[model samples]
Target: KIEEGKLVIWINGDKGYNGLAEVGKKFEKDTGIKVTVEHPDKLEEKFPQVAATGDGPDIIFWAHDRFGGYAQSGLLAEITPDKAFQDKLYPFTWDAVRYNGKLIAYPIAVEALSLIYNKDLLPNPPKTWEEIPALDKELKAKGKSALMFNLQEPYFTWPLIAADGGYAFKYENGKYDIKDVGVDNAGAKAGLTFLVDLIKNKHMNACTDYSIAEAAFNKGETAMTINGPWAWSNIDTSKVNYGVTVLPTFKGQPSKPFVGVLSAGINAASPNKELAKEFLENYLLTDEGLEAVNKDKPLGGSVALKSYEEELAKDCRIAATMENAQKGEIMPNIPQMSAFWYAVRTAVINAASGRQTVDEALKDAQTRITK
Candidate 1:
């Protein structure tokens, strides 16, 4: 009953699926092992459940946030790549795959937020967040907002909160101290105050979420938005004349949004673990392999493979995102991050919407998350 010559991987979208499908065919032809790639519904939620029963795909490719939970549940096998291979990737990427000092996944790509602007509307992007208000004065006359983004979404707004050096947890020596929550600190208050001022002055839509912000930008109703490579697909289809640049300095410091990794990890319970490892190490990690997988998806946001830099630079958005990613904060791949997400989301929405004071919301978040 051992399916000795077959391997399976679960991915979430069309671009990666199609790209890997071709690679799978090549793998089959060369190694005599059939590879199947699937895009199952509700993957994030279902993967752990199926994996617990020893019946999920041999490999799962997704964001690194779930790695801690999976590894903790004994669903992922620790991957130890030699120094030679590890040297080919950005050192920062390794932080996302290490859970409890064990390497649980292979980092395939990187992603972070950057300032994406409408080239026709702005002509030139602002070099600092302070300059945006002046630009808004001109844009207001054109029946457009100077900027709009997911003001209530932490992924989009964390740069604002982190502009003055705020962090969800204290990261030190390559690990997060979950007990030390920093969202309620002075720096975060200043950042939140800036957002509140923008909202109060009508410079930003107070309740903008991802769809609202993306739609406004796509319709040319906003001159700029903060987004990552994943947004490019829809933005490209909308035919907006756009350009990407590093996020403008806020309070004389760079905004530190969360940088995420899209990773390839093997299931610990998989019967095909060796084949999956071979596929990832030999077939997928190569230049041709990574290049093919990222050709359309670019979900890795920025390229983690140093050799792919020349190719990544060809796309301006990706290039700028990569630049910004170097300065961004790596998302904590810890189980406590679940509480951080929910707590911070609640706080951002409350503070941004004036339902609660920034101080009140952040304090509530600190208590809720720490509890």
Candidate 2:
């Protein structure tokens, strides 16, 4: 059974989906299948309920982080692209859409955190954590902090925690081993210890959150911060002279952040699954369609299509986003990842606030995440 002549998709926000709707006009003209893109509030909240009954949109667009849960719950249809279509996108994007060794979504865009430094303050940004201490001292004399960022959030600190060797889950043979939690390993301990030292030495404040850090950096009170492209507009709007680059290394090892993929997935419960896949592969993912979609996206957004590299690289911030994405690990898309955020956040806060030793806090995190 299949729904005839029309397709519906749910997406968040007003700006980006309009681009898709515009492209949909072409889709309707060519195939006579009207594509409706709806921007609905609380999609994450309502999708699960309606999708379980086979009453949801044929496609839903969102960040890949939540797809694991949907796929595991049998709410998302597997979407295997043909070789030619797959070759048109960045190879790493497939990692985000995979669940239990099956492709479950089409990656639309990619993003990751990177070192965003005040160009006026540091003519050349430091390339390693070791270089930060000297900059901190210099900034102290200038009444500015060297680095201010979301210190207590695991999403932002994962790079520092993983610099030596920490990961949310072990990936092997093209799949994640959910039981093999590595967040509390020896390397992770050493890495977080270094972060603790930074806070203890007053190089960074343990209390700094996203807003405080972004505000300080925008106001020129902080010389650097770790942020993603989403924050670029505010910095640009504030007219701060800033530069984006790959995150600095930690003790000679790379500080790897999590790469987030914004994607679109078909609803498994939809009767129009085949048509949905056809829409994605033939109409929406083609060059003209992608261009229509990206043209409406705000500046600094990065699309996964390889053909757009030159256009994106023309913007320094967007180019750094792509660079950082290449070096980063795909945010693990697995049902088990649901436990990671809360557990890691607790451990980070406890360790950062001195409520628990780093080792003890991480050990607790491991237990809670896997339990």
Candidate 3:
């Protein structure tokens, strides 16, 4: 009787906690099953420790980027959504939540980067990277910040690297050759050179973080920012007229942001596997279930369901995000990629601040991330 007609869940406190509470309440009432939601102080750190005790969350609501680490460590249960449900979700959402082609989670939310600009400054967003320098000059002349890019966050910076021909892993016949690292290539150096120029030329500060970038754009001090849908809540449309568009293609290469997906996974050690599956398939994927996940006005990001998110796209913010997401590559959530996130971020900051030459910084990252 380990099933016990009850379910336990551990959700990260970082995202949509209140909405999840409401959904959990509804699940308990409708199914006559006791449901508990607890926020472990740190999911990435604590979930594995607890789950390995053969008693942890039946389900963990979190970002898929961590799924591979848990799955490979034998901490996650294989979880395949119904084929009909899979057809309704964005196919790309599946990529991040998978470990070696096996589905591992139920996708709930998705995100990607875009140029969110002040309409007053940029009546029309640029079509290519060639136009951004000119735009920067014009905005600076008018005593405005041209763009507020989070230099400290590699998630926003690497799009330029990839567009300029740098890649985390070389694509080889439908698979990533993790052995063929691309961070130190000519294209990456070119992209790194441009970022250094931006800082040296005073177009953007080298210290752009979430708070600095978000506050500057929302206060109308900056004309634009490269950010994801998560920034939508802080924006007041009346205070700052905003428009969202895909980032300009970098010097002719296709500029693509990393598309991130948030999903739910099961603990491989859970005692109630069937109940967990039912809770996800029936109570969490329905129209009612998804609404709970996306309760905020304007939404934090587009939902994974094609039909559901399309309805939210009437707001244009959602549409812009969806468009850019479609243009992005899912950051492979393999255990190998754990090294790239910090290595790339360090490369951008060190190379820009004169701590290392562009070639040296990139080469170091490549050596460190040879997965």
Candidate 4:
């Protein structure tokens, strides 16, 4: 079924409202399905209340991780894509939408953490974690620092831990088994030790903040920083030449950054479920729809179809970063993940700042998960 008139939709406000408006307009023109897009600045506050009552917009765009919470609360519609649609998506992209054997979301884009470097400062970027320390040693000998990393940002460290074969949770028997929460694992301990060692050894400036890290890379004060595609917009491409690649691996295990997927979801309670689904089908799965999202340049928003990889790669660095991310684990969309975040954040901070030993911090994290 096709829609002739307007369909009300809700979008998150993290990205610019005007960008969504432009995409909505294009979607309307292409499918003749009028889209009345609403941007709520406090979506986190508003969505839960509205979704709780089962009286929300016909469609909503959000990160995949939230699916677990929404689904657990019975606030989302299970949207299992047909085989045809499933076959067209990237493998990692499909995994992002699957939760407990039910598909609650349709992935629109994929994102991964990457090592961004200033080409003018270090023409050759380090290819492994071991190389990073050695490169820093060379820089220090010359009275310069090779890099600055955000030691306080869990978003930055999770991948480094993964590169050392660490993980937050493990899945088995079709259920998420967190038997070996990696925040305290030997490999993870080694990874955290490496980071703290960098600060203590003066390989990286302990005073580095996120903004400073970005500035250092952009201003050529530091050779590299580990971040994600979202930083691309903030970077002054004209100021200096830069390159992005996956974080270097440890012990042959590639750094697996958390892959975050933004997706479109249907409302089970909508009177126009069929029409809404059709509109989404055309908007997210078609070439026309993918192009609209790509044009907006929202932080990490791009088409998730493998068929559009080359087309999107031409403009989106996230597309290229995903090539390495595919080898990493897809972030879990489970309700327990909330507990995991709080525990992991505390552990990472304690370990990095010397407030606690790595083993103690990790043990605390593991206890929280077990309980």
Summing lDDT over every window of 10 consecutive residues in candidate 4, give the lowest-scoring window. Answer: 294-303
lDDT score, residue 267, model 2? Answer: 87
Residues 1-371, candidate 3: write the lDDT tens digits: 23767887777654656667777889888878877788877576688777777667778876687787778888888986778878888787777687888987878888788889999877887777666677889878878877887888788888788778787877688777878988999988888888787778777788777778888889888888888765665685448889888777878776777777878888887677778888877777677777876664333457777777766767677777777777767777776676777799899889878799888899999988983
Candidate 3 lDDT for residue 104: 79
Of the candidates numbered 3 and 4, which has the greater lDDT value?
A: 3
lDDT leaderboard ranking: 1, 2, 3, 4
**Higher-lDDT candidate among 1 and 4?**
1
Model 1 regions lying over 4 Å from their true place: 1-5, 12-15, 28-46, 49-55, 299-302, 310-315
Off by over 4 Å in 3: 1-14, 31-57, 90-92, 297-302, 313-315
Worst 10 residues of 3 by lDDT: 293-302
Clashing pairs in 4: none
Q: 1-371 in candidate 4: lDDT tens per residue?
A: 22435577777753334555666787778767677777776564577678777666777777677677777777777775678878777766777878777887778777667778877667778878778778887776765568776766676788777777677778788777766576678888877777777777767764566767877777767778887665675674548778776677777778777777877777666567676667667655676666555555444524577677656565435644766567666788887776777787788788767788778987898889767
The local distance difference test score of model 2 is 0.81
**Model 2 alpha-carbon drift over 4 Å, by segment:** 1-58, 271-275, 293-302, 310-315
Superposed by TM-score, candidate 1 places the C-alpha of residue 46 at a distance from the truth, in angstroms, of 4.3
Residue 322 miss distance in model 1 (angstroms):
2.8
Q: Quote model 2's TM-score.
A: 0.82
Q: Which structure is stronger by lDDT: 2 or 3?
A: 2
Please state every model's RMSD to the true fold in angstroms.
2.8, 3.8, 3.1, 4.2
Candidates sorted by TM-score, descending order?
1, 3, 2, 4
